[PDB]
Symmetry: C3
Subunit: 336 residues, 3 copies
């Protein structure tokens, strides 16, 4: 398509919402290709990542860790207006794994504090993809400071299983997983810093151990539990998009399964089925589809249980509904 043809295309402005929720969208594409517009302001800000009050000088797209999920359809154009406020101190940019060229847009979006840029790319490949800051010379630090998220490019005909059968979810959740490397003092207590730069040297040292001090969902230990636990009901079909821009993860819905899992996150690659624990390599997004059959609490975790329960990679699902004794029943409850 020529510039003229693209300028004639309809344009829709979408308002992003904070993870784990996803902005309103249609699974089946409406009309022909469109230029979907998104705006995100970068905010360098202090966030607390655990109950002890541990701090991280985050670099967050739209002010959240992970950045929000942007949703478009295959062959739509994603036009992102990216803003780096003069209140920030570092240069920032964005790399869309879903895009093609200039390091995912990285080479065309380098913005200093006080600048903005508008990048447009054709979403030619269907699936979920990671996006993240990629400044030449300080990539890992910015990424593990939370500057990453994901987008979903839906097939124009919505989701289907490997054999051509439609898969329509009732709800969708985006679980961004983040590995944090927080310096500790001689007492083994997490250190705090006045400015983000102050922490760089100590942090690089921790990063070199390839051992995160924290592995969390939605920016903090327990962020998706309690009044913020995800929800569903027996019978409900749920799509769980999961991303990790720097380190491997292995999602598992404890008490359930991954009925259809596009482990590689790409829709033209048939999904695996009946999964117990699936695998998403660092630098990628994956997605799992499940129809709940039992009510009660579920633990959604990175299945290296130390990472899940000692480091913070665990969420919960609260599911309402009738218990099914055919699937499972306590013949004899715990007793003498």
């Amino acid at each position: 398509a020529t510039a003229a043809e693209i300028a004639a295309l309809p344009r829709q402005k979408v308002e992003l919402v904070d993870p784990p929720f996803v902005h309103a969208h249609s699974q089946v594409a409406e009309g022909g290709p469109k230029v979907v517009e998104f705006t995100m302001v970068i905010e360098e800000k202090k966030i607390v990542i655990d109950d002890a009050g541990t701090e991280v000088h985050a670099m967050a797209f739209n002010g959240t860790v992970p950045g929000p999920l942007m949703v478009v359809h295959q062959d739509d154009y994603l036009e992102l207006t990216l803003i780096n406020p003069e209140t920030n101190t570092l240069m920032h940019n964005i790399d869309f794994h879903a895009a093609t060229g200039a390091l995912g847009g990285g080479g065309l979006t380098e913005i200093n504090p006080g600048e903005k840029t508008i990048l447009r790319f054709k979403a030619t490949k269907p699936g979920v993809f990671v996006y993240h800051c990629a400044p030449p010379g300080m990539v890992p630090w910015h990424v593990v400071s939370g500057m990453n998220g994901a987008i979903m490019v839906l097939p124009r005909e919505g989701l289907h299983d490997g054999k051509g059968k439609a898969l329509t979810y009732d709800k969708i959740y985006y679980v961004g997983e983040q590995d944090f490397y927080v310096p500790r003092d001689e007492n083994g207590k997490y250190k705090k810093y006045e400015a983000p730069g102050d922490a760089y040297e100590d942090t690089v040292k921790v990063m070199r151990t390839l051992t995160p001090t924290h592995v969390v969902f939605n920016g903090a230990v327990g962020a998706l539990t309690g009044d913020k636990a995800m929800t569903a009901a027996v019978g409900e079909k749920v799509l769980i998009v999961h991303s990790q821009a720097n380190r491997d993860t292995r999602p598992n819905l404890i008490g359930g399964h991954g009925d259809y899992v596009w482990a590689t996150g790409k829709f033209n690659t048939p999904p695996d089925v009946d999964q117990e624990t699936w695998f998403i390599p660092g630098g990628a997004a994956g997605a799992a589809f499940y129809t709940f059959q039992q009510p009660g609490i579920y633990a959604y975790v990175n299945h290296n249980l130390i990472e899940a329960f000692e480091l913070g990679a665990a969420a919960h699902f609260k599911v309402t509904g009738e218990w099914n004794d055919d699937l499972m029943t306590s013949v004899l409850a715990p007793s003498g």
Copy 2:
């Protein structure tokens, strides 16, 4: 299925055998759905895991690490009687990744010493699945203390390749891989403790480094080598079920291949073929089918060779039969 129908199903008690061996079963189901009954007694006991007398206070299903492999067919019901003797001191339960509901059954099987429980669940999905102890608050600790195993839910029609061609094995082995985190004193000597709880704080510290001191098959370094090597003959078809409940692994039959590998461990997902090294994420089981073509010794290992030969993740296969010079031959033996 009606209520009367389940109650009318034939009940069958099966006697378990210790890994790497598997209890008697039929690949193709025999008769309609059944309620397959198993019983496992929990044993807390000190075991030696290496050639240096290193000890671990194990928590073991049926007294073995890994716990035994339970085999049923899709749509049978697995009815497990789980016993926690009054001689034990810790709380236990069981999570079946193959099951649906109550956190895999963990929420219905919490038993203290002196208690027993009976759990029944319908094996609705075919494949090999991990099962492990999972009491709220002490999940990773108990799991890395060896309280995990796997089950196999065979398709009623047995296994088939991606083209619908039946895959019938002559022998089946279950290799459970265990990551252990044993504390060391300031001199580097592994510590010993009087009771399980005594080692808790020291052990969690090692666990948080995400670096196991040992990675073993069947509970100890060398457990599946020498006089305990697994066996086969040229021409025999063997299925090797492999599990790892907490950490990733990458099996490889050195000298052979994985002719058909259900890397994810789920039979409705077509197997990969001609594999050199496959990958099983922590929290899952996988299965590899192979037809031996050459006699001799084979090393079956986790292919991060440091984990295999420095940490303990290596086993052997001793295969009888005639050598095939077409496949391989020494044209010129080592010489000056």
Copy 3:
């Protein structure tokens, strides 16, 4: 085939080239089965792996790290003459994951300094496979000293996608990823040694942490950048073979994609498509096929960005051609 039938097959002597380039070959098999001959001299030599002058006592096949890529077709016989010069001080051998029997040939190829051997095996399975030194007793050490490579066994009919369409590449590159464990002194400085054996005790201790000090492509940090960046042109089809003999990796062509990726490295296993980041387990090789659509610099990395940018696992592609504004364009360049 009988010994006589094999002896009558046509022979072809191949001259190997240093990675990332690959020796001349035909994607589609030229004629029936043949005995393809290769010769590799083992070289124990010092290599400098980073800009701080860090040394490693390398054990390199054909003098490089990784060893060169050998290409044959399915059902051809690979006949390798391996030489261990009197100048070397260690026993060496070779294990081909592509072969069948005697530990991949390791049991039939043990040669001391001053010895040579000739091994022939039938390449019965198509795909890319790892090969590495495998002495009984000192495996991980030699492997992580750089003694590993890969071979490609192409289907007689060349490559095809999952639907049977031919995938013909214009260029092919072989990226060997190496994890190094270099000892340091109490001041955090990398130690140097006068002979290979001198660093053994120290290296094992570092290997036990399972945390490499360096993760590099083609033997050194920046080896595949600058004067050695890989090249291509818009419209060109490129196959990127990638191997890791001891540790997991997750390749990603930043700016592009993996249009077709045989992640497990085996050609009879359908390739995944439109990949952002793929996964290759330690002890295996994989291959990705991509058609460039945009000119410019691309970063090819292990997508754990710490491993890529702090540890060394990063390469570059320099692509020439016309920029495609339909796929990506800067609507608004960085500005106030």
